[PDB]
Amino acid sequence: KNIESGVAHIHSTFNNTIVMITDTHGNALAWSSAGSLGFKGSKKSTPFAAQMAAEAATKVAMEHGLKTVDVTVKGPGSGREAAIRSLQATGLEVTAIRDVTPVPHNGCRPPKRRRV
Amino acid sequence: RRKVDYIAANHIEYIDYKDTELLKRFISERGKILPRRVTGTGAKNQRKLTIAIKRARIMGLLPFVS
Amino acid sequence: PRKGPVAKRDVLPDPIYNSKLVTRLINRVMVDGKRGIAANIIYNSFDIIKESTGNDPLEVFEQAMKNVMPVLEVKARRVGGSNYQVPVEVRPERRTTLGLRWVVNYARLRGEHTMEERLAKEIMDAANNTGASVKKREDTHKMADANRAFAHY
RNA sequence: GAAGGCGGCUCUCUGGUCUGUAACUGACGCUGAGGCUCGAAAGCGUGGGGAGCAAACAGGAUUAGAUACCCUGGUAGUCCACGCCGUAAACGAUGAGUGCUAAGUGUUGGAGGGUUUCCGCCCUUCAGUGCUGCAGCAAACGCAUUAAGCACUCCGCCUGGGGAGUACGACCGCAAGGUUGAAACUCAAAGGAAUUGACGGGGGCCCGCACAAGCGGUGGAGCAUGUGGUUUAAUUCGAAGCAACG
Ligand SMILES: [K+]
Ligand SMILES: [K+]
Ligand SMILES: [Mg+2]
Ligand SMILES: [Mg+2]
Ligand SMILES: [Mg+2]
Ligand SMILES: [Mg+2]
Ligand SMILES: [Mg+2]
């Protein structure tokens, strides 16, 4: 329950952001998202929704007990900045940041465009 | 701009993939190879550097990422 | 307009209380240029407020405006296939205009026998946070908080 | 690399090209119908395989409808080996070869020279690869030592548009269909480039009670007036989006 620090996994996309706080070896400690907060439609894709997600997840995580986190960013979208600022505000000192945006190295065929 | 090649200035040749000391400065963070227009090497030497770096990567001397 | 803002004519004070809110409220409640009838209505209403309350009518009206004036509007914006609202920090003059408008409209909507009584009851209810104008305030703020996500827009 | 096309890495085998060299053969070359070979992707046959993507298809939506665009799934297929197919906006929409004809600039692979501690810089030169541009060419756009200039050799191809790349025949192909390839009849145009306008669910700049912000109305009732229909012997004639209808 009570631990020292973990990680911040922030899977931001065009439709939703999903914040997940985990221990350094992996086993999770909290998570939340815009739909969890109660957002709908395009509101899920918002920095405010990412902010509220980080708020709720940090509240639960601090209720368990911790102080600081590393930040593992992944994906497009603009919730990154607002969510990180809200981590700082709700208390978790942002130890460090790194993006792990997967580079396919030309690995897979992506689907067609949204026309033709 | 007129710039100088490390290789030309140093009079080095027969680039071995073992030469991490020389290959690692032609690499940016997370292992990416610097462009020729950044560094200032010739095409021949640049291609030899590409091959040497890829050899070093597969042989663990240097990383693909991070 | 296309050519930038427009500066408005100043406000004339009230003869007896020496205030601008009072004169602008006269202008609000007025219909067909009848400053006399409007001013009489307002002075008699504030006489009722003096009668049923020892506080100054002007202070009670200030309190009502503090309790009705919003801080956040909703402004409409049409993004292609969906038109939706956006919260907007309200300019201090727009605050007072909306306050007077809400007060006066819901006052004349109230079902009493004279505009004097209607306005006095509405102002006192607003100062005690019980009026339809305060309902309107709460509705606008709740919509601002429900569409708060568009802070960037 | 002749083209199609070819980007991780190493090895096996192998092709063409460039530079000098001026030893050697001594016009042996170029083009090249007809033939032979290669030949994007789709597609066909046999057998494997199949992560993702994805025709067909299903469902949800949208829509007047939507046999589509959007979404979620998803089969052949995409992949490997062999054998077929032999088509493309297979395009530099420019056949191959040779020579001559201002210059400028970058760049790839070299060579030579004059310097430079080497590096490097400079000058010359070959083979390519881009941009600007003189002459000239061009209907114009544009091209211009990688010509669409001046010339010569050879091959292929065109003789208005459509019918029609159809029919008949022949050849090829497992098939799909490919190669060759007309006529009847029909039009007095079809077309290229550029110009002026207009238009744009194209861009940029600006303005207007144009929107916004607001106030008050019309549309609902009754009446007045005008208009349309309709009735009428006649219901005089004119006016018809903004710009006709007190
Ligand atoms: K097959
Ligand atoms: K135009
Ligand atoms: Mg194929
Ligand atoms: Mg040119
Ligand atoms: Mg308006
Ligand atoms: Mg009416
Ligand atoms: Mg008129």
Which residues numbered 47-76 in A keep a CB inside 8 Å of some CB on C? 47-49
- In three-state form (DSSP H/G/I as H, E/B as E, the rest C), the secondary structure along chain C is CCCCCCCCCCCCCCCCCCCHHHHHHHHHHCCCCCHHHHHHHHHHHHHHHHHHCCCCHHHHHHHHHHHHCCCEEEEEEEECCEEEEEEEECCHHHHHHHHHHHHHHHHHHCCCCCHHHHHHHHHHHHHCCCCHHHHHHHHHHHHHHHCHHHHCC
Residue that the structure tokens 């996994």 belong to? A9
Query: Under 8 Å CB-to-CB from A4, ≥6 apart: which residues?
Result: A66, A67, A68
Report how far residue C64's alpha carbon sits from residue B52's, in angstroms, rounded to the nearest whole number: 79
Distance C60 CA to ligand 3 centre (A): 86
Q: What is the DSSP letter of B29?
A: G
Contacts of C152 in chain A (CB under 8 A): 46-47, 78
Residue that the structure tokens 């429900």 belong to? C146
Amino acid sitting at position A27: N
Q: Which residues pair with C89 in a beta bridge?
A: C72
* SS3 state of residue A19: strand
Spatial contact of C131 and C106, defined as CB atoms under 8 Å apart: yes
Judged by a CB distance cut-off of 8 A, whether residue A39 touches chain C is yes
- Here the tokens at position A4 are 């020292």
Judged by a CB distance cut-off of 8 A, whether residue A34 touches chain C is no
Q: What are phi and psi of C31, to 5 degrees?
A: -135, 125
Amino acid sitting at position B1: R
B1/D100 CA-to-C1' distance in Å: 39
Method: cryo-EM
Amino acid sitting at position A50: A
Provide, for chain B, the percentages of residues in helix, strand and coil under a 3-state DSSP scheme, each rounded to the nearest 5: 55, 5, 45
Q: Please give the distance of CA A113 from its chain centroid, rounded to a whole number.
A: 27
Q: Which residues pair with C75 in a beta bridge?
A: C86
Contacts of C146 in chain A (CB under 8 A): none
B8/D214 CA-to-C1' distance in Å: 77
Q: Please give the distance of CA C55 from its chain centroid, rounded to a whole number.
A: 20
Report how far residue B22's alpha carbon sits from residue A16's, in angstroms, rounded to the nearest whole number: 45
Report DSSP letters for A59-113, one per residue: HHHHHH---EEEEEEESSSSHHHHHHHHHHHHT-EEEEEEE-----TT-S-----
b/e for B34-52, b at 16 or more Cβ within 10 A?
A: eebeebbbeeebbebbeeb
Report how far residue B18's alpha carbon sits from residue B33's, in angstroms, rounded to the nearest whole number: 16
